[PDB]
Design a protein around this ligand. Structure first.
Ligand SMILES: *[C@@H]1O[C@H](CO)[C@@H](O)[C@H](O)[C@H]1NC(C)=O
Ligand SMILES: *[C@@H]1O[C@H](CO)[C@@H](O)[C@H](O)[C@H]1NC(C)=O
Ligand SMILES: *[C@@H]1O[C@H](CO)[C@@H](O)[C@H](O)[C@H]1NC(C)=O
Ligand SMILES: *[C@@H]1O[C@H](CO)[C@@H](O)[C@H](O)[C@H]1NC(C)=O
Ligand SMILES: *[C@@H]1O[C@H](CO)[C@@H](O)[C@H](O)[C@H]1NC(C)=O
Ligand SMILES: *[C@@H]1O[C@H](CO)[C@@H](O)[C@H](O)[C@H]1NC(C)=O
Ligand SMILES: *[C@@H]1O[C@H](CO)[C@@H](O)[C@H](O)[C@H]1NC(C)=O
Ligand SMILES: *[C@@H]1O[C@H](CO)[C@@H](O)[C@H](O)[C@H]1NC(C)=O
Ligand SMILES: [Ca+2]
Ligand SMILES: [Ca+2]
Lengths: 594, 594
């Protein structure tokens, strides 16, 4: 009998190994906390943030159950704004420390189990770059590193070869008196676009990627992908106003950009970036993440960066939606969620971010009442929640100050220093005359004040990430949304074998009442609030038929049943999942077939 | 001692297996002989060629050392010309036999060691197709199988949504009175373009590919790849003449086609076609070939179909060059060869074809004197030589006849029936009033006459394919061309370890004399002609300094030396190879490292 029982065990183990799904990578589980390196924490007492200040506050990052950091671009740049025109990719600016300060930051990050991500701008460079200074003199192989074209430039003004306009001004062809030819920049006067059609240039970007990968940056995040390649035929773009007179079109909005955005072969360059990073992802635990971050485009063009089922391009493109939305309601939020889940290919991992560097703050664009409900929506979605720095608490925008450095007046309100304490400059730096004035109402909004008091908008961010990390329904579960309303958004998170669902209700309306008996069938007489926007109500009792919800109010309901909505014939076109799996309570393991 | 000698043998075998390069596939070695199914051979005595007639003449195909057939598109088509508008992809027309006649043809081909290739047109369909007849009525899923757009069509004339013109006429948007909407065809009034943005349509093409792959067609050959996808924004194309008045542009030449050719995502559809055929290529000997056949475009766009080093797209695109060349000289032929070898990525397999269906005959475009020299150029190049039907001998064009069927007046001169015998209709068919009049001078030009007489332009095609198949220098060897001349084209074929080179000299001039001592160094006082255009110098003696060459004269010199040009520092930018390998005379095996 034992001789049969010994193989029945080996057959059981080989079945578990064959039925166990692939474990979620570090970029799939755990939220991200995007950090601005200049407005997070200062250590050397100079006025600007540094990489050492992020290492000192590393314990606070783990306190929020954060997995990845995604530090914003920190390079030796002559232009700190406008897509971060870099003049030296291998070196770091005098600010943010030195190369040794960066090596100690990534090492301390790996000791606490965290992951790092750095921004990468392969599209353009700076005017002070060693490649551009050698290109104007036609020195060696660098003579064709940029898009150069012969243009006429007489006594008074320059004439571009075409009407191609830059995103931040006029005349995206500028003339220089050294090379006597116009160069294509498309972003700014001091940001020449790096010609990617040169095989030498495409290989030079590989050396920059491998340089940081050996340091252990644990992935990249491309900035401008759709501006890589342009049309070889320097033809004029189609104007939006056909009757418009020429010599007047100077705005990037009044022009159809069909020859300077998303050209043939642009994705193949993105496909080659993943192939280079794949050489460093051979380790079982050391996987490399790659983000495209293509903003200001339609939904069908964003989902193209996910790749094809037979060729890998990128893990996921950064979800620009939910950030440009100024006025939120039941229909605007529902349209954004369905636009991403319906256009994304199946088996991919979505993502969501409420705010970012080039966007207004949450409480300044939506309001202080929507800070709690938007944080729950970020953690109750199947995608990877991405959080901006200072977004876990309610940090308002600041007025535009006149800085001597070349910085964008707009989109600078989000670069305010992090409010740590209630001391001078909100504890961001012990020095005076900081690079940006700290927000005025910092004595009432800071990490130290919100930690000591209950019912604050800091504990809600803590237990949401804890609920997202501990519970398996939020990590890898189905997403079944319930129709469309203008005063409430309700969706259900479920998984096979759990015998328990999560009902998330977000108001986004005007203090209306919800009847849960009209949306989901089979709910009992009473249901418990697992997580309330106002902590004073967690673990309370509310009946389904009639729920009092305020403006900025959101609830999470935990119901025990084996009546998952994803199994019913009605909820088949409104249920999405990335990794279909079945849970087993008896044998605590993940199953594919069930 | 023996205990050490036994492992020294195993170490030798495991070294040979590890150093042996990959064997050349069936599409890399052996020439192709493209056959027109309607003008090759008739069996049922009806007037038109059939697939059974190709089976009867299969022994002649093997007599030319031909590896692949590449039968031109033979489907149930309502339009036999203009890119072969098909109305039924799963069935065959009444002509060319039935489905059983095709199954007996592919089976007889595999018995003689030959390979088959069929043409595939996934771009468009016919008006009588079951998909188009079901699309005009909006019946089920077929309502979006074609590019439909709402257009105005009042009493007198239709108005297209844009100025997009077809390749064969005006107004590539036509109106139908059933669906009351304009459909996009881009080729002809009865050739609606199949909308590929529909996930259903892209999957329906997979079922057509798998249908023929189970029959054993041994690969496909796509017809129109650059016309698959179009721009979703129905914007007007840029006119070549800016001052041109609208309502007059009706020619495909006077318009820049930037929104209807080579769109973003077109290659991804081609990448998916190879992924479907890869499921049938798992066998070691049963490999599937895929050709793109993108004509009328630049060289940088044609080499993009070769694929990337990390994703396979196609084996090789069909080389449209060397066919549009009407007047041949030393510079026109040299530019074509260098344009393909310099733009093609390394490790790929090139190709060459002198003529085709949509091109004039060789002796009618170049002359009867250039028939012999162009056949040698096809077999002395590293690519896969592709030969049109009737091209091995000198077959002239015919005058344009008025046929009752919808056929193109031009490009029909190449569809003349094959001249087999000197009987009625040149032995093509025993019936009268054939579909196309056989060329008049068939009593002097036929396969039977050229076989019995020596010094004909049929034996030169036989021993060239024999020399290309037997000798390894022509199969997989280096290609080092010697500078540029206007009265002779000289290149050298060599391989490491052979200790012997092949010097090919083609005149393409006006009966000039060549001094071989000025081009290649190290040649002896006398050299032998392995293969000559005029089959009389085969084994003669000619000194290097001074060689008498006529207008249509070509020579192959076989020199024994270990001074290969590809090893010298001067001939490094003019030497190309696909599979770099080293030969060993002692051990008759192929080596990678040497
Ligand atoms: C165009 O050039 C002029 C001259 O500097 C400048 O004042 C103007 O701001 C430019 N247009 C835009 C939109 O920046
Ligand atoms: C822009 O379009 C409008 C037509 O609606 C008209 O003002 C004109 O065609 C254009 N404006 C100017 C100043 O030309
Ligand atoms: C800062 O916080 C501490 C404790 O919360 C408090 O005692 C102190 O009065 C505060 N100082 C200012 C300037 O707000
Ligand atoms: C739901 O969506 C449709 C179209 O988007 C809209 O017409 C309808 O008013 C919406 N229903 C509610 C309750 O908002
Ligand atoms: C345009 O339409 C007219 C009407 O049939 C036709 O005669 C003409 O041939 C068309 N143009 C071309 C280039 O075919
Ligand atoms: C085409 O271009 C030429 C200018 O070279 C001129 O004839 C005109 O602009 C165009 N022709 C017509 C008939 O409009
Ligand atoms: C055809 O060929 C045979 C042998 O070559 C010859 O005897 C006969 O006279 C020829 N007939 C015609 C009509 O050319
Ligand atoms: C070779 O090519 C160059 C440019 O294509 C041309 O100027 C030159 O005349 C050519 N030399 C000969 C002998 O044809
Ligand atoms: Ca660029
Ligand atoms: Ca099409």
């Amino acid at each position: 009998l034992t001789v049969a029982s010994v193989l029945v065990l080996i057959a059981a183990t080989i079945a578990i190994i064959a039925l166990s799904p692939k474990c979620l990578d570090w970029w799939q589980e755990g939220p991200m906390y995007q950090i601005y390196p200049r407005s997070f924490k200062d250590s050397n007492k100079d006025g600007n943030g540094d990489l050492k200040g992020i290492q000192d506050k590393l314990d606070y990052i783990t306190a929020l159950n954060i997995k990845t950091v995604w530090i914003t671009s920190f390079y030796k740049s002559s232009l700190k704004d406008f897509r971060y025109g870099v003049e030296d990719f291998r070196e770091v600016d005098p600010i943010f420390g030195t190369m040794e300060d960066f090596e100690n930051l990534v090492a301390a990050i790996h000791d606490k189990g965290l992951k790092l991500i750095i921004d990468f701008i392969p599209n353009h460079t700076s005017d002070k770059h060693i490649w551009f200074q050698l290109s104007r003199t036609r020195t060696g192989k660098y003579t064709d590193y940029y898009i150069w074209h012969d243009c006429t430039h007489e006594n008074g003004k320059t004439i571009p070869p075409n009407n191609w306009l830059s995103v931040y001004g006029n005349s995206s062809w500028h003339f220089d008196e050294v090379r006597n030819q116009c160069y294509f920049h498309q972003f700014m006067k001091e940001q020449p676009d790096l010609n990617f059609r040169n095989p030498d240039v495409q290989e030079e970007i590989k050396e920059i990627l491998r340089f940081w990968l050996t340091k252990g940056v644990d992935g990249f995040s491309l900035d401008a992908v759709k501006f890589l390649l342009e049309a070889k035929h320097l033809r004029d773009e189609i104007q939006v106003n056909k009757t418009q007179i020429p010599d007047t079109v100077t705005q990037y909005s009044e022009l159809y950009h069909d020859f300077t955005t998303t050209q043939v072969g642009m994705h193949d360059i993105v496909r080659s970036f993943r192939q280079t990073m794949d050489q460093y992802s051979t380790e079982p635990g050391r996987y490399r993440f790659m983000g495209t971050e293509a903003y200001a485009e339609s939904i069908d063009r964003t989902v193209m960066y996910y790749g094809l089922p037979f060729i890998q391009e990128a893990d996921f493109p950064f979800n620009n939606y939910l950030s440009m939305l100024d006025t939120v309601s039941g229909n605007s939020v529902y349209e954004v969620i369905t636009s991403w889940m319906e256009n994304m290919p199946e088996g991919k991992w979505p993502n969501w971010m409420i705010g970012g560097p080039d966007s207004s703050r949450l409480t300044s664009r939506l309001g202080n009442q929507y800070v709690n409900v938007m944080n729950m929506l970020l953690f109750t979605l199947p995608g990877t929640p991405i959080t901006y720095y200072g977004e876990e608490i309610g940090m308002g925008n600041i007025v535009a100050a006149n800085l001597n450095e070349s910085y964008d007046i707009n989109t600078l309100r989000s670069k305010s220093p992090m409010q740590w304490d209630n001391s001078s400059n909100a504890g961001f730096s012990e020095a005076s005359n900081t690079w940006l004035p700290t927000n005025s109402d910092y004595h009432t909004v800071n990490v130290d004040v919100q930690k000591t008091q209950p019912r604050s908008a800091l504990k809600l961010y803590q237990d949401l990430s804890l609920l997202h990390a501990n519970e398996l329904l939020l990590n890898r579960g189905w997403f079944c949304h319930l129709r469309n309303d203008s005063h409430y958004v309700v969706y259900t998170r479920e998984l096979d074998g759990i015998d328990r669902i999560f009902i998330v209700v977000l108001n986004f309306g005007e203090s209306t009442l919800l009847n849960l008996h009209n949306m989901i069938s089979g709910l009992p007489a009473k249901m418990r609030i697992r997580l309330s926007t106002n902590s004073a109500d967690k673990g309370s009792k509310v009946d389904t038929s009639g729920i009092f919800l305020d403006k900025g109010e959101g609830l999470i309901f935990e119901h025990n049943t084996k009546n998952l909505l994803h199994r019913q014939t009605a909820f088949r076109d409104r249920c999405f999942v990335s990794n279909r799996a079945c849970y087993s309570s008896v044998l605590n393991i993940l199953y594919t077939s069930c």
